[PDB]
Structures are given as structure tokens and as C-alpha cells.
């Protein structure tokens, strides 16, 4: 059964503006340790962050819990996946979450994501 | 089992332009009585209407099109967006055996989007 | 259970730009025979292709292949459905896909689509 559903859309220019004003602050707040390491060497880190933000916001909505607790990674097939930390992980176990489905897309100006959590 | 799936994207400026040209007409057709009352006094009414359009269009698609005013959006006691169905849409959900409706929406400066899944 | 989830957003002006470069060659690539026939006489071929593109990319993400293997058609009622060919059809049979849920939307500047495949 579906236990939760979330979506988000992110204007990439909005994230760019935050970075211009705050520097690394946003990424340090919302990225897990593994994601931070990617951020540091990424060729397009603003785009990377905006896409991560979209997924994390979609995940947070699906679960109804800081953004750095919703880690996005790509599995052995190259498919985007969620790995939970801390309170988010405890909530997942509490809710009886068995599967988590993640998708994201980006165009030049916008990134989008949808997350479904399932028993 | 999933019984239906719908999505929509709404350019807020389009809603703004229609309201500028014909005022209340757009809102009157698609809003329930409760939603109309909110529309009339909302601090950001164009954004309110745009976001309502995204959810209603997504819902209508999920139900496999139904009048938008029969897909009432409300926030529950925890503040989460939910559907309240009326008339033909309510009877349809009963006939389809809908047990669960899942609604999500998002908005940026220029666009709102929404996805609805209905489930047995 | 949900077997896969995909989403896409397509900037229509980008598709228009691709068509300016290579004419009908993109359509030749991503469209099945049935879609190609519709393309030839469409009133708005750019929009048609952009919308097809969004659905096809979302479907490919849901399955985790080629775009011409994910045919979009309208059923007797008028709602979008997927018809699979070649490798896509074989993969669906392997995964035991029972239902394929498709939705799409378009604004002036963007098309979007979400696909859910189910057991
Ligand atoms: Cl407004
Ligand atoms: Cl209507
Ligand atoms: Cl066109």
C-alpha cells in the first residue's frame, strides 16, 4: 500500500541566488556526508544541489526530519534511491516502510522530483 | 492497487492574465463553495487559484475524465492537502472502490505542480 | 506493488531547437510506426513530440532499451496508455508488470509526465 507521496519543483536560479548570498551554507545544511563529498568535486554543483533539494523536499512531504537525513544515491543499476538517517530512518521503521521510489528530472531552468513510499 | 494517476503543471502568469481579463469567472467555475470563500479573501489569490487548478486537474486525470468544483481541496488538522469529493465524482470514487487518495503539490515563483494517486 | 516510478519535464523550446537542427530525424528516432503516422499530419508537431518525449523518458526511468519501444496511444476513452515493443516488452514480461499508469500535462513552455509500473 502507498504510505506517502511527495513532489517538488525547484527553480534552479533560486538555488543559484541562495549560493551567491550564502556560499556553502545551503549545501552544508541539506546534504548528507556522502552527498557533501559529491558537492565538493561536482562540475555543476548548483545544479547538483537543486536536484538534491527537489528530491529531499519530495521525500519530506511523502513522510509528512532535516534534509540531510534523506540521502540520495544511485544503485548498482544507476537508479536513484533513498538512504535514511537518524529520525527519518526511525520514522520509516515506525511507519512500516518497505520500499521507497524516487525519480527526478531537470531542464535548464527547473528540477523536479517525485517520491512514493510503500509498505 | 493503484486505480488512477494524474499530474498537472500550471504557469501562474497564465492564471494571472485570465483573471485580469475576466475577473471572477475562472474561479467561480472551478471552486467549491468553501474554496470560493477562501479565494475571495486570500492574501495571495492568484497563487491560491493556480495551486487549486494544479490539484483539481491532477485529480480529474486520476479519476479518468468531471467538474473541477467536485474536487474540493482542503487541509486536514495536520495541515496536509486532501480531497473532499462531491456529486458525480464522489459516486465515481465509490463505484471504483477508491479507499485512499494521495495528493501532493508544490509551487515555485512561476509554476505550480501537483500529482494525485487514487488507490483501492 | 510498485515496480518502478519515473518522471520528466521537457522544455518545449528545446525540442523546437532540436527540430530546427535535424528536422524529422528526432521523430524518426523516438517514435514507433503508429506515432510516426500521427506526427506526419499533426497540427502542432513540436508540441506532439515534446509530450511524447516526456512520457517516453518517464517510462524509461520507471523501467530503469530505446524510445521507439515505448509507444504512447489513446484508448477508447481518450486517456494516455503505453504499448511496448522489442526489448521493453521483453523486460516488462520478465519483471511481471501487470499495470502501467501514465499521466502527462503541458503548459505553454513545458510538458511533464509521470509513469508508474505495477505488479
Ligand atoms: Cl497572488
Ligand atoms: Cl470544471
Ligand atoms: Cl508545434
Nearest CA-CA partner of C5 in C46, C48, C58: C58
B8 annotated as ligand-binding: yes
Cβ(A113)–Cβ(A55) under 8 Å?
yes
Ligand 2 centroid – CA B68 distance (Å): 4
Neighbours of ion ligand 2 (CB under 5 A): B 67-68
Q: Which residue of B has its CA nearest to A6?
A: B104
From start to end of B1-120, where are the E strands?
2-11, 71-75, 81-85, 100-107, 111-119
3-state helix, strand, coil in chain C (%, to 5): 50, 30, 20
Ligand 2 centroid – CA B74 distance (Å): 18
CB pairs B-C closer than 8 Å? 47
C108 vs chain B: nearest CA distance in angstroms?
8
Cβ(B71)–Cβ(B78) under 8 Å?
no
**Distance separating alpha carbons of residues A16 and B43, to the nearest angstrom:** 28
Q: Is C104 left (phi over 0), alpha (psi -120 to 50) or beta?
A: beta
Residue B90 burial (C-beta neighbours within 10 Å; 0-12, 13-18, 19+): middle
| Beta bridge partners of residue A10, listed in sequence order | A111
**Chain C window 61-100: which residues touch A at a Cβ cutoff of 8 Å?**
61-62, 64
What would the grid cell of residue A78 be?
Answer: 544507476
Resolution (A): 1.8
Which residues, 6 or more positions from C71, have their beta carbon under 8 angstroms from its beta carbon?
A: C32, C34, C35, C82, C83, C84, C85
**Minimum-distance ligand to the CA of B31?**
2
Cβ(B28)–Cβ(B22) under 8 Å?
no
- The answer to whether the CB atoms of B106 and A5 lie below 8 A apart is no
**Distance separating alpha carbons of residues A61 and A58, to the nearest angstrom:** 5
Q: Which residue of C has its CA nearest to A5?
A: C5
Nearest CA-CA partner of C5 in A4, A44, A88, B81: A4
**Distance separating alpha carbons of residues C16 and C23, to the nearest angstrom:** 10
**Minimum-distance ligand to the CA of B19?**
1
Cβ(A29)–Cβ(A49) under 8 Å?
no
Q: What does the DSSP 8-state code read for residue C116?
A: E
What would the grid cell of residue A1 be?
Answer: 500500500
Measured in whole angstroms, the distance separating CA B103 from the mean position of its chain's CA atoms is 9
**Distance separating alpha carbons of residues A64 and A42, to the nearest angstrom:** 31
A117 vs chain B: nearest CA distance in angstroms?
11
**C2 → closest Cβ in A107, A110, A118:** A118
Ligand 3 centroid – CA C13 distance (Å): 10
Domain B1-120 annotated CATH 3.90.470.20: yes
- Cα angle B82-B87-B91, degrees, rounded to a multiple of 5: 85
Any alpha helices (H) in A1-119, and if so which ranges?
12-22, 25-30, 33-41, 45-62, 86-95
- The answer to whether the CB atoms of C11 and A109 lie below 8 A apart is yes
Measured in whole angstroms, the distance separating CA B106 from the mean position of its chain's CA atoms is 12
| Beta bridge partners of residue C80, listed in sequence order | C74
Which residues, 6 or more positions from A30, have their beta carbon under 8 angstroms from its beta carbon?
A: A49, A52, A53, A56, A66, A67, A68
Residue C29 burial (C-beta neighbours within 10 Å; 0-12, 13-18, 19+): exposed
Chain C contact for A13, CB < 8 A?
no
Topology (CATH) of A1-119 = Ribosomal Protein L22; Chain A (3.90.470)
Amino acid at each position: 500500500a502507498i504510505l506517502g507521496l511527495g513532489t517538488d519543483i525547484v527553480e534552479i536560479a533560486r538555488i543559484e541566488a541562495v549560493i551567491a548570498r550564502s556560499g556553502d551554507r545551503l549545501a552544508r545544511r541539506v546534504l548528507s556526508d556522502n552527498e557533501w563529498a559529491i558537492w565538493k568535486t561536482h562540475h555543476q554543483p548548483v545544479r547538483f544541489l537543486a536536484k538534491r533539494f527537489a528530491v529531499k523536499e519530495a521525500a519530506a512531504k511523502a513522510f509528512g526530519l532535516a534534509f540531510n537525513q534523506f540521502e540520495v544515491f544511485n544503485d548498482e543499476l544507476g537508479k536513484p534511491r533513498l538512504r535514511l538517517w537518524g529520525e527519518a530512518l526511525k520514522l520509516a521503521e515506525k511507519l512500516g516502510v518497505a520500499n521507497m521510489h524516487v525519480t527526478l528530472a531537470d531542464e535548464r531552468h527547473y528540477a523536479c522530483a517525485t517520491v512514493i513510499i510503500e509498505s
